[model samples]
Target: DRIQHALERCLHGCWSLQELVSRDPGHFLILLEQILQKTREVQEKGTYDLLAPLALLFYSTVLCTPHFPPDSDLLLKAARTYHRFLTWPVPYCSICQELLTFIDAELKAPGISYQRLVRAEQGLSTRSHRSSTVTVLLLNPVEVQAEFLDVADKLSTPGPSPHSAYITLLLHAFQATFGAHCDLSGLHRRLQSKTLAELEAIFTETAEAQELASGIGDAAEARQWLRTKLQAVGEKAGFPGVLDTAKPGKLRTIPIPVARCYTYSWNQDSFDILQEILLKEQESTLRVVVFGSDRISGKVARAYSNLRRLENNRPLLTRFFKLQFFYVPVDISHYLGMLDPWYERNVLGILADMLLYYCRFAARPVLLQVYQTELTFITGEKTTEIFIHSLELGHSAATRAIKASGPGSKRLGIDGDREAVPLTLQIIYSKGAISGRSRWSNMEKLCTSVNLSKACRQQEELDSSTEALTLNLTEVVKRQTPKSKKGFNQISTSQIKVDKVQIIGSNSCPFAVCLDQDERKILQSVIRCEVSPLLCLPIMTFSGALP
Candidate 1:
């Protein structure tokens, strides 16, 4: 009865239950269980009016409590309550509905969504909230000018600058450790008054002599010399790297190991300094180092760092940071696991469309090379190679094509000591757990009637298309399977190779067949080219037999 009275008093805002818990730790679990039971009973009977007290309890216990895992029983219960609230009609429960929305927003993982919710709940309008959410301001003239204005205003103010507290501490540590050897007097003064560009310029001006003395052409060597001095001085000062260490109950000096230093490259001239920081190896010290930037150079440097970390089997060395870059936006509909086959197919389809666009004026060989290069850029070189090997594909002029000599020549049934124009076509390449693989090749074709009223345009004719062909080539197997026996139900890394291709359409183009290479091997694999001689069709559909 006393426990119930204590709960009622706490729930009614007479006093904080947390304060009671702190005073009497023995009843903490008892009070929590009683609150949970009361919440469940109120929810079970549909007493929506009494939900506010339950929500207050939840806010104090679940949201404010530290180290609460998402999977905890209490949190799961909260999620269920919020989800139920979502299903209710809005008018009667409108206030609770809004509260649940805010709670749901807070529960989301740390990302743009959570940040948006935090801003929204803080009473910022949707427009202003959105503008403030993007922390990594895109480097532009307006943003740069705004930053400069802030700096100028802060410099004129009587109070210390926002960064001055940390700057002062770091300066004291370095100055104290190495009074004469630390050439940071200029650095210290410039840091107080100068813009980021001017600060870099000071470093650059000091570095020129060092670069020449070190017999290095690049500015990287000079920057490394400057960093080495700072690192050495900072280490000797017993400086704790992070400021937010668990504060002692009674204040005293605490020694914390300095593990890593992060250097960011923001300006155009900062790349060399970034490069120096990334490339330099620490001398006989176990410390991690990081260099951050959004540019391609940073990506390459990250890959370099990962490779070095793997080689040494030590994480203390220069290692890449993945979460530094903003989260990649992805479609929620195709929410398959990482590198899923369907996801890969969607990516490939987009790339294929891009490849077709480049084909408007580009020759087959040139476009294929461009396609390969783009693949490397999209999916790293390693992944590109894996994708390429899955399909039995040849890109160059070596792949055979069927010749359709001239548009009307084949329709007129003219056999001649004629020139053969080779037609180059890529065998269809599909990867991943593709649905309807069997149906892909088994697609029924009805040879629709063709009107030969229009003669082939002379502008469309290519005499040199078959001129690049070789004299002889290996014959493709005529009886090869159109579809593989392997099912595409589950994801597999299995490679499907196709030595033969079957064109689906008959009298589609002016010529019978046009390929990049010779006719001997190409003719043996021409499945759909076996058309009626009387058919004067000018247009037909084309497809490749899947393997």
Candidate 2:
């Protein structure tokens, strides 16, 4: 009641004081000082209840209207009055710190003033173009939030290992859906640049003038037309997933954008770059982060867990590859909740397994393989597991592949890139992996299941290795070829005067004898010290990995 009475007095004084200020300067100044002193006293005593009146006063005075002569002296007076009010203690004390901090930061911000000064010096730097607008399909926010909250609640309770089943569901649902993230500021700038703006305006005009009218029949026709326009935009931008927007009738050709997905450890530097590149820039143009969370599913358990196997016991991979990505975050439960009951389980299972293979095994080490060499160290278990699983699901996938041929897949719901796997692996791996030491193909031996040495030798033998020249065939053959070669006697090829020199265990023993191209190449690099150039000189030994 005291606060209310005080507020009543303040409001009455403010109304009376406003009129007097214009007429009597000396009396008005005294009244203004009195009002300020009284207000400060009450505010500090914690008995002020003029928040509503003060807020109205502040906003109204600061915001001048076109209806009135907005450049009023009263507004300036109000500003000074508010400035004085800020100096006193009040419930709104946080405002003082925030206002001053913002002012300090703005003044100190590097290159900001320079940027503005440069812009002013030049008329405008960026050009504008027009292009098609990208449409985003969002999950129902309320439903998605509610479902995830339920998942959180369940995670809180005592559990009976509902994880696998839950994950299975989550993988299917979320994996199929993708969330597109974009750099708000950068994209907004890029989109509005001169050339982009022009292109956008052109697209907008064409979209509006589209001949297809409204009604059900025209709506179908309009949809077909829209698809055609979208395809044009895609072609123009040179980016994938531009939905067709020209034809309206078919409505079948809306393009979904494709994105490059990768995984790595969660270090500050790498994550920052990734967040800037992927989360901000690429996210807008493409679909989804490498891997993220979903509402229906819990964690993408299968995908995330398998990333560990991809690390294997490799030196770099074990230390560096620490994160995994997913196409979508929705788990199977969310998918089930969202999808039609009879949409088909077999298709869903195949999709889930496919993502699991990539995320678990292929994603991280595949990335690290580019940055870190040492092949044997980088095998991913999830990749091996998924390969085996694919063999099991091969039938469904093959059937699906056949049903949906071309570079894209209708059955898989993924762009048909059966060929893209090896291509993707090679492209990403080679580009990332190329350092001074080795070519990517050189590591193919370590990537497979067979013993690399045995496999290498077998391939050489299969190639009908160049004949050897030897005076003492029995002695040399016995020494070079290993014992227990039951098929050795079957060799009918005769020895020659000149032979291609073969060096076995060159990698194991860097100090081994001189050989031909492949062995010579391997030996020269591994054996650090120079071998004597003169043939008559004694051969120098190079220490290998023998410990």
Candidate 3:
């Protein structure tokens, strides 16, 4: 094939070219020029495929090898190659755009002299004091590709649907099995693109490849491990399964230099300060210690997602600082409340009291309480279908009490307070007929959420609610008259609060909720927003349909 075809080989070709370019520049220089020319003459529609290799070339040559940078001549020429691409019109190409973004990031935050101008690292960063290698489990590439390709075609033409079930279920399954070790944020970035090949490229990039490995396996072992997982998952149609290396036995273990050796990494740009900090350090023998965890084990004191790069950065900044680090791996999932159902069942009693307290007192709005606040200008049924996920509030007293004062407060995850309240709720109404159909449905889509963080109205001076929210209108419910207007399903006006919550899964998840119409409508809407937690799981809002 031609140079563009070679280029289309993606990372494989780039690495091959990188080898040839470094080994014998005299012969390959013209070849590189021809490749660079393609970028110059790239048509608008073909820009994405065209720029892909050039970006990979940039990454392979400069960014991939942090410590041993190539010479100034090579650096200057490569920079010029990108310059040529930039010289082309800035069309609406994702590769071109991200190429610019990564380049722009280097401009704002870069390394020393000709060698230092590379893009951001692609995983988490951390610091440690030993060769403590943790095993990173991965989903079979086949499984990932199968699931990713399913979305790839649909999203290939236009863009990805974050709200879609395939992707969401895939994401849920990933989180369910792997916990927090995978750089989901990186996955999110991958999702922002428009090509199946790009998506396919990234999903296939997880073999502890490049500078991301710590005494990385003989590349062959990791490669074989990937093959093994793919084969196993293929045998089981394991799209929903996980491959964990957490157990010492599961890892590609050898006697030489063996303790717990893991490769924890994060993207260089994932953090606001990562790039700039490295840029400043490029001036001298800079040394800094970064800490990141798997988001499990109470490791995240503040920003959860931001903390993931500790494993990635510790080694990264180490190489650039010309100072290597002893990495300590933190797995966000494998530990903690991952065991199962008893936790929610045990904790529901407390949650019930909290909700009961609010409904009984008619307290001011809170995160636990749903408050869209501004009187919704109801355009009637046009806005009727409700589509959303279970919503939760963060920074609540319940979460604080568990995290701060709970057991294992010292370590957090193991024995620490299950400061997380993944609360579930249900809404119930007795069967009857009402004047009109106030539309209520699980609008997971189309129905966006309103902020429920603060009170609907201020209660600064006066501390008393005018009336209790859980006013038992037994008289109103009992006085129901008319039969079903629709002549089929019964509409229940007689909804009394059935405050029950339960933990039904093995993962210690407090899974479901049962709330009557009285308790539910007061809260009005229980939509979806995944911030921290108070998970507010309670999914059902039942107004009896022909009971």
Candidate 4:
């Protein structure tokens, strides 16, 4: 009775009910057990109003407290307990069953009538209070200009000049990080749409230089060997050797101008050159705006500081500084967890929060005009660029990834002919008429389709818009499994690898038979949903008559 009073009184206070446990150390387990008992009783009676409070208590009791931060044994135990709690069968709303994947077990309970519940869930319900839910913001980047505009207005006041031409200079500075094979499509044409020959030659030169430097006898010999290799390569490439001097077998001089330009020194002379080149060709007065991820430090600063001359040419009153870094889930255990709700919150929620923070700048809207680049390209999105070095570097997520590996790993696709990157997106806002869920789904599909076209256009000469190929998530297997063996299944990655590409003027592809199954099912589903019986018959009749 005394404990219950204390808990009831604590609930009415500003701090949590469990606050006493932390302060009065001896009161921890006893107080927690009482709260847990009450929580379990509420849960047993199918009263879920206290679900959020119960979740908080469960986490604090097992995974965290004043006593244990690095208690893996305890954290694991807590994690498993939380997992069980989440997986427990409970009554669910109809909308949740249809849209959410997590509530499957609850919705499938005997005689629950999911169909009836779905109708109710789909119907708008007004409750004074409800359980709190997390929100996510997914960004969709169209063209580079549109992307820049998304964040530009948030960063500064309106400028009189058009800032479009300055995007080229940003691309140039961005490419300098890579020692060779840097390109901005349709711009300079240096590495644009080049064949494998150019890539191979660059690799070969780096390999020879590395090998020669290692084999030399002394420090002096090693330095001389490096000089000789540098000179030979330098003459061919028109880059003078920095170590080259007058003495035979001595190091030659390297061009200060070349090194300074490549290293991107932000000097007065360099700025002058940039101003002369960019301002001279300017059709409009503009200021460059950039929105980039914060994972790689100083990219925007370096790019902006070097390319300020382009802004000088544009006629603009103010410029924008828009940079956004989407938060990525760094904890490996979170990714592989059994119950992934917290994991999702930790990862996707963080990303959503960052985007929202940056978006606030768009209210003034100076930032909306800048380019926003999310670092992780989750397959098809254009605004994101994955750092290949990080993926390939030591102790990184890509290096630690267990799923994508080996010769059998389906990267770049079969025959090494194709590659597809996933789409990246952020949700800003939808009209009052459009439900948040529906808008999100459509945006996802839009970015996905765009990536499909972009990737195909880049890799092959085919007209992208009318291309016949589709990236299928669920390709059919040759032999159907028994229904018992088919519950909650995933298709093998190998199926995605054994792709059937549609080439123009060709009647069939390599895996035509298997590919046709997915196509047929999709057409059938679409016909069932949208096409009317009368229209189908008329279309069929017309097609037969034409043939």
Candidate 5:
């Protein structure tokens, strides 16, 4: 009774319960069991509320601990137990499903950093209290400048100066971390779009030997140490040596570990050089930020420190990622040398290794100016990036389920193209206008559809819409299974649930697909929720191939 009370009371999130388990240690095991028990119950129920309290409890008790952290065994147990719910064919809400992935990340290495997970789970409570209308902010980013403006008497305020630029920077940063649902069609560009080596072999910056000698400690000797370090990481990044002059020997390549760094110093007043090298999209080729050294030090660090005054000219190294030390001895060296930083938050740890990826949309959007939805999926080589222009079906409940990695599919009519071979999305929706069941009346209605076509133009005026809640959960239909396999008379029909995804409404809904990549860094990079979900769903057993 007390546990249920705690659960109901802390509906916002489990901070209360986190403290509950924190203060009363024995209750931790009890809460864990309670969570596992309920998680099973929800899956059994087949359809769960948008408020996935069970998952929240798991987060509060296990992952969101600023106080009582669990051991690897217990954490792993929770991790695996929670894994079952994610795999189930049942329908969990967007936030419900979003937290599941973040849980999975922490399960791999708990306590390393829960900053993303912490804010993710908070969306549950934070979302409940928000005003439903966030329209103007969702259309174009410039509309946001008005919110921060006011100038009737002149020297008025921080309407849209450096402050607005800071907001834009924060929004881009969030998309990298937690801004899953915000529309980012044109707002974001591929930063770090090119490589050090690609930008190399020409362009105008030459190192002067006379000027290099005047800097600081062991000017000549330290330069050698820095050169070797950059050379070491350069080799990992596919460069033979740091500079064009340096030659690579056959035996010179077989060195330390894999995935290292390489950074170089730039005393140029404008950070444009680094920006041009890292930010401007010189090619469609996406330049990924691989791993780098642990810290930053020496002259470049001090130079970056002094030059970076109030977010001026595109501070690439200091703002987004820092690959110092292993790259160059004198470049900005601290782990993220954002000393006198811009956001005063963790940005470096957030990137480099991942140039682009996805995350979940927050419950209450505390970030982003727009909220359109784009979902990308990768099977072997081809990536299926699905853009669902508008999912306003006027139904009470709607959901989307996707199944990836199956035998080559012919049923969906996407045979030769690699995009839909193993990937298929099923739209399962309820027709009811109001909320859930009562003993007096069980008001529930539903239908299904399968979809994967380019959406209407995002720039096209909305109010322009589409219909047919269609899908055949996974490809390779009837040839694969029999109806008795999962059986009917359950929450869903005969076909079993292969994977889970959520399609819900009002805001941009996101449907998540679990991906497996050989070297999954690119696959899992910034895995924000790729689909904006408005449909509540359960992609099930194409029993009788539900056409």
Candidate 6:
């Protein structure tokens, strides 16, 4: 009764007991010590009524006092209080739980002289500290080698899908059991020297190998055997059917350290590229460049072109050099129907999104250009030059050259509709770069591309007199105005409010808004403008401008 009343007085006019203790330790320490004794008495009496106050007192002491005397009564009491609380069943008060967490962190906190307490308990001098030695136990490489070979031996029993089953089995077995300690070199060598030779001999049904091989003769039989083996392994592991279904664990590898760009220089010009990157890199914009042409057919040709251009203007920026070179064939009609620039532009936007996904995952830059071989308006023939060729349409002269020559233009696994399914691509990108950003959250291709489509009134005609080739490339992000709630008897109409607007693009691209004076005033109030340093003649709207 006396201690409880004293605690009540100490808590009075003080919302935070910790602050009270820190401010008036002389007053609160007496009450804290009283509460600690009462806590032990309450625990001995088998009651939790005082547990909350007991926990609070211990935590308050812990928070207020950092350095403890070697044999301080408070130190021993705090440790004993923590042990008592831990042994007690939970269903503790919220603050009690918090107190426990604090106590745990206090022990683990840096600069804690636990050795002093240990020495004091041992009745030893402060300097009488013992040195502890740590032993590293290495796995026996021979035992590891035998375990893997045993799995291989079990797999070697001639079966259908011998090679496939063996590879799958070893991969799972090694991942589950071997971990980082073992690299099954013995098994690999045996496979190389013995099993491979035996398989080849069995394939031909040669005389000497006939006794050695046992599984079904055909490929289908081997496949079935592998399936059965996986199922059996799965069942025996007490996770029936999981071995066949479970994803393969990510194998550990010694990651190649990213080489600093400054270390290697082709010429002194490499430093300049790095300088440019440092000066030009933007955190919000993800840069990627995809160069595809009928002329560049394979990885080698694409690599040669990309590397050559990169070598010439190698940006010292670490991100600038990490470009992904994809060799997509120029002709698409046979693969993805007719050339609709409007549709293809959307497709290109999705590809750009995919590129953003790659760059973001790889921690590279955004795509500044999607280069294609096209005939300039001045030149009648096909050439590779920078121009306003819509990636949405197969308008590039090289692409048109192939397009004009009917259906057969060689396919290399790229289809606009099939490959860029909005949801599928979004998911793939989401895993790496496009986790959650407002830009990719809305359109059908919302998650897929940064180029957002908007219904803007056509500002100008694509007339013959004007050399300005107008393509609807502006990506406008309009904030939707909230609708006011109507009463049951109210009659009303919807009013459009241009709440927020942002314009991004080259200043020279001739940007103009369609709204009149009133709407323009409304737009200007919320409008944000971003200008790109690398703008060109062909107008790409500010809507496609990155954050």
In model 6, the runs with Cα more than 4 Å from the true position are 1-6, 10-28, 93-547
RMSD list, candidates in order: 23.9, 29.0, 25.0, 31.1, 26.2, 28.4
Per-candidate local distance difference test: 0.29, 0.25, 0.26, 0.25, 0.28, 0.29
User: What is candidate 5's lDDT per residue for 374-443, written digit by digit as tens?
Assistant: 3333232333332222222211111122222122321121122122111122333332222332112111
Please, what are the lDDT tens digits per residue for candidate 6 over residues 1-547? 4444645564331223333334332333455566677777777886754454355445544543432322335534655665666556554434445554554433333112122222121222122123221111111112223443343233223332434333332333322222323333433443443364343332222111111112344423433343444345434433322332333422332111111111112121212333444344332121222223322222223333344456555442233223332211222211111111211222232132222222222211122222222222211222232222222221112222323332333222111221111111111111112233322121111211122111121212222112111222211111111221121111132221111113321111211111111110111111112111122111111111111
Candidate 4 residues lying further than 4 Å off, grouped into runs, are 1-3, 10-18, 63-84, 87-547
> How many steric clashes between backbone atoms does each model show?
13, 66, 53, 56, 44, 20
- TM-score against native, each model: 0.22, 0.17, 0.25, 0.18, 0.23, 0.19
Stretch of 10 with least lDDT, candidate 6: 517-526
**lDDT string, candidate 2, 1-547, tens digits:** 3333443554543232342232322332333334444445555665434432343322222111111111224323433444554654543443334333322221222112222222221212222232111111121223334543343333223322222222222111111111121122232233344353454344333323232211213423543444354345435544233222122211111111111222232321222333333334223121112323332121222223343444375332332222323233333222221221111111122232233222221211111000001111011211111100000101112223323432233233222122110000110111122133422221111000000011111223342221112211121112233342432222333332221111111222221111110110111121111111011101011100111
Pick the winner on lDDT between candidates 1 and 2: 1
Query: Lowest summed-lDDT stretch of 10 residues in model 3?
Result: 538-547
Give the Å shift of residue 257 in candidate 5. Answer: 32
What is the TM-score (0 to 1) of candidate 3? 0.25
lDDT of 1: 0.29
- Candidate 2 whole-model C-alpha lDDT, 0 to 1: 0.25
lDDT of 1 by residue, 1-547 (tens): 4556777665543333333342332243344556667766776787654454455444433322322222335434555655566554453255346545544433331111222222222212222212321111111222234443343233223343324433433343333223334444443554566454443333333223222323333323433443455454334433333222222211111111111223233343422343344345322221111112222222323343344335465333335321121111111111111212212222212221221111111111101000111111111111111101011211111112222322122212122223222222222322222233422222222211111110111112433111111111121111132132231112223323222223233222222222211222122112232111011101000100001
TM accuracy, model 2: 0.17
Q: Quick one: how many clashes does candidate 4 have?
A: 56
Top candidate (TM-score) = 3
State the lDDT of candidate 3 residue by residue for 1-547, as single tens digits.
3444544453231323423333322323334454555555554334443354344444433322221212224434444445545444443243345555444432222211111111111111112222121111111122223433332233223222322212222232233223333334443443444254433333233222222321333433433444454335323432322344233211110101111112122332333343454444344121111233322112111222333335365643455332221111212111111111111112121222222111111111111122111111111111111111121222122223323322223212222112223222222222112333333322111100011221112322333321101202111111122232221112232322111111111112222111110111111221222111122111111000010
Residue-level lDDT tens digits of model 4 in 222-257: 544544564465356433222212223211111001
Model 3 regions lying over 4 Å from their true place: 1-8, 11-21, 56-424, 427-547
